[PDB]
Amino acid sequence: ANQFNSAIGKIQDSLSSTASALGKLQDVVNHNAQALNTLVKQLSSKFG
Amino acid sequence: SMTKTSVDCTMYICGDSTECSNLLLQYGSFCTQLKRALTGIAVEQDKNT
């Protein structure tokens, strides 16, 4: 009970201080955001 | 892992002429997506090792 409760408390302190562990899920937002923002800039170019 | 390659937009399409690069900027982001896709392969080839 000293080992298990202290090990799960380090997980809660790491996710609050550092957001870099969730950055694999942040790329899934960023792969969808950079695909939509590049697709809407196709109308500005004159295509020849 | 595979062989990591990179393709330039300027040297492959244009022969370093001034008339080729003027009409290349009207096409825009066509080779910008193709350059960053091969960059994203070469990051993941190092993650496989």
Side-chain angles (χ1 to χ4, degrees):
Chain A
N2 291 337
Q3 292 177 335
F4 179 77
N5 290 337
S6 64
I8 196 65
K10 294 176 179 177
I11 305 300
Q12 188 174 355
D13 291 344
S14 64
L15 295 175
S16 63
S17 178
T18 59
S20 63
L22 294 176
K24 293 177 179 177
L25 295 173
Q26 294 177 336
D27 291 344
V28 181
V29 180
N30 285 336
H31 289 299
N32 288 283
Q34 292 177 336
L36 290 173
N37 288 337
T38 311
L39 183 65
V40 296
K41 291 176 179 178
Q42 296 298 320
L43 301 180
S44 63
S45 60
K46 294 176 179 177
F47 293 157
Chain B
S1 64
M2 293 177 70
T3 300
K4 294 188 296 184
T5 58
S6 178
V7 175
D8 192 9
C9 182
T10 302
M11 288 176 67
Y12 177 74
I13 296 170
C14 294
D16 291 344
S17 178
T18 59
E19 296 299 319
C20 183
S21 296
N22 290 337
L23 296 175
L24 181 62
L25 296 175
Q26 293 178 336
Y27 292 136
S29 63
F30 287 160
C31 61
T32 305
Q33 293 177 335
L34 298 175
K35 184 178 179 180
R36 294 182 182 175
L38 296 174
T39 304
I41 293 171
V43 177
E44 295 299 319
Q45 292 298 319
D46 290 344
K47 293 177 178 177
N48 290 337
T49 59

